Structures are given as C-alpha cells and as structure tokens.
Amino acid sequence: MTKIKIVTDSSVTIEPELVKQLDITIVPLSVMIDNVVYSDADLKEEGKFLQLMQESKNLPKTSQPPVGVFAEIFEDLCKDGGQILAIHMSHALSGTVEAARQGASLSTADVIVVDSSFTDQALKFQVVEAAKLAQEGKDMEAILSHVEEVKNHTELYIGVSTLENLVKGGRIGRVTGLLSSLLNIRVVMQMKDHELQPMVKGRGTKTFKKWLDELITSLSERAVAEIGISYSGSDDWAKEMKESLQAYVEKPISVLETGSIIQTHTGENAWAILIRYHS
C-alpha cells in the first residue's frame, strides 16, 4: 500500500530542509500588503516580510487558503492511492482547518483532518512526528494517537511587545481576561485549549526576563523532549532565551523567525517558547 501523506499549513514554523526530507506538503496562506496579495510561500526568506510590514502604508491582512485549493491538493496527493492526514493550526486562530475539512469532503481522497490546537513550532511537533511515522509505514490510527500524545504533552508560551496587531487582526477576541488601558505594553500568554491566557503584563523591559526565570524554575522537575523558540524582529532575545533553556533539553533548540502569517498578528519583537515534554 501507499504511505500516508502529511499536509499542514504555512503557519507552521519549520526548517525547510525537514519539509523535503519528510515529504510534508505545506498549503500556503496568503497576506495582502498595500492591496497586493502575496503567497506566504514567497515570504519565507529571513527578514523579508518583516521589512515589508515595517514599511507598508497599511497593516497587512492574512487570509486562509481556499476550500478549493485544499480539494485540489488532496485530489492530486491521493493519485498514488494513499490516505492523507492534514494537521492544522487552531480553529480559534484561523478558519484554515475548517477549509481543510470542507476540501476533504469535496475530494475523492481519503482525508483525515486534525486541529493541532496550536501553530508555529508547536504545530511543527505534531506534523514532524506524524510524517516520521508515516515514513515508517504506520497506519492512520497509530499516527493519530501518537500525534495526540505529542499535542497533549506540548505547551505554547508567547510574548508580544504591543497589542495593536492582535487588536487590529481580531485575535484579541481569543485572549481571555486581559484588561489593559495601553496597547504598547509587554504581555506573556499561554495558548491552552485554543485560548490565549495572560500570565503577566508590564511596561518594563524586564517583564519577559522575570517570567523566563519563573518558567525555568518550573522546568526543574520536568522531562523535556524538545524546545523550540520563535521570534519576530531581531533574534537577540530569542538567542538569549536559548542560552538559559538549552540546559533543560538534550535536543538542540531550534531558533526560527516566525512566518508572515504570525508576524502580522503579533507585531515585531514578539517571541514564543514551544515545549514538548516526554510522553
């Protein structure tokens, strides 16, 4: 029989070489910059979108992939007779996973669609694990259950230096219980069960450092499988966090610029820590 094929979306943050090595298909979102629509696939060069967003007259606007695009990719991918497992960013952030469900129903292909409950490198954990097992010839039930195990041992922490992109883009509606009379302020949230939960907020330049010290304390008694760090803007703070965190995980930490889809909604000088604990 034909190996299962893994699909995800371009909100995933992943080393490009791993996409090829694992035969992962990435369905691109799009972003409109000063009324010109770019495919996210053309916005992967380091720092390119950051510069565009710094200079554009308008805040960019992100768009999910069309239903019909998923239908056509699913139809092409199944020509080998194999099943498809599509793992996507949370429905709370984007309609992408729902467009995939609809594309699956329109296709003649045998398509399973899974909401990762995250995005960025936390979505990467599930997609990579799925594709590794797919490559080994595992069946759909075995892959789904291992992906779920990964999801359920994953945590996502995100810091932003302004609220304005979250407000304008709308995903502030997913932040539970945040009260700020200021947009320009530092906030650290945990994405848990499709909600952004504020852990702390503050104007000061030490708001992230003190939170980091608390995270590190909490890691003393945890077995950690993988940590990834993502950022928008410069990588200075991300590299600093890596220096403190690398001691807590054997696997080398991936420090990656987040994609245009995320940058549009977080703003510059944002960061994420994506942790996967041992199952």
Ligand X SMILES: CCCCCC/C=C\CCCCCCCCCC(=O)O
Residues that bind ligand X (CB under 6 A): 29, 62-64, 93-96, 119-120, 156, 158, 171, 191, 230-232, 258, 261-262, 265-266, 270-272
Residue 163 C-beta: closest distance to ligand X, Å = 11
Residue 207 C-beta: closest distance to ligand X, Å = 16
CA–CA dist 29, 16 (Å, integer): 16
Query: Residue 277 pairs with which residues in a beta bridge?
Result: 224
The number of C-alpha atoms within 13 Å of 179 and in the hemisphere containing its C-beta is: 1
Overall size of the chain counted in residues: 279
Q: Which is nearer to ligand X, 22 or 167 (CB)?
A: 167
CA–CA dist 267, 271 (Å, integer): 10
Residue 42 C-beta: closest distance to ligand X, Å = 16
Cβ partners under 8 Å of residue 30, min gap 6: 37, 38, 39, 40, 62, 63, 65
Residue 274 C-beta: closest distance to ligand X, Å = 8
Residue 12 C-beta: closest distance to ligand X, Å = 11
Contact 258, 124 (CB under 8 A): no
Residue 272 C-beta: closest distance to ligand X, Å = 4
Q: Which is nearer to ligand X, 96 or 254 (CB)?
A: 96
Residue 161 C-beta: closest distance to ligand X, Å = 10
Contact 89, 100 (CB under 8 A): no
End-to-end CA distance of the chain: 30
Residue 22 has a CB neighbour count (10 Å cut-off) of 17
**Phi, psi of 215, rounded to the nearest 5 degrees:** -60, -45
Q: Which is nearer to ligand X, 5 or 88 (CB)?
A: 88
Q: Which is nearer to ligand X, 83 or 121 (CB)?
A: 121
- From the number of C-beta atoms within 10 Å of its C-beta (0-12, 13-18, 19+), residue 167 rates as middle
Q: Which is nearer to ligand X, 74 or 231 (CB)?
A: 231
Q: Which is nearer to ligand X, 120 or 129 (CB)?
A: 120
Q: Which is nearer to ligand X, 143 or 158 (CB)?
A: 158
Contact 153, 276 (CB under 8 A): yes
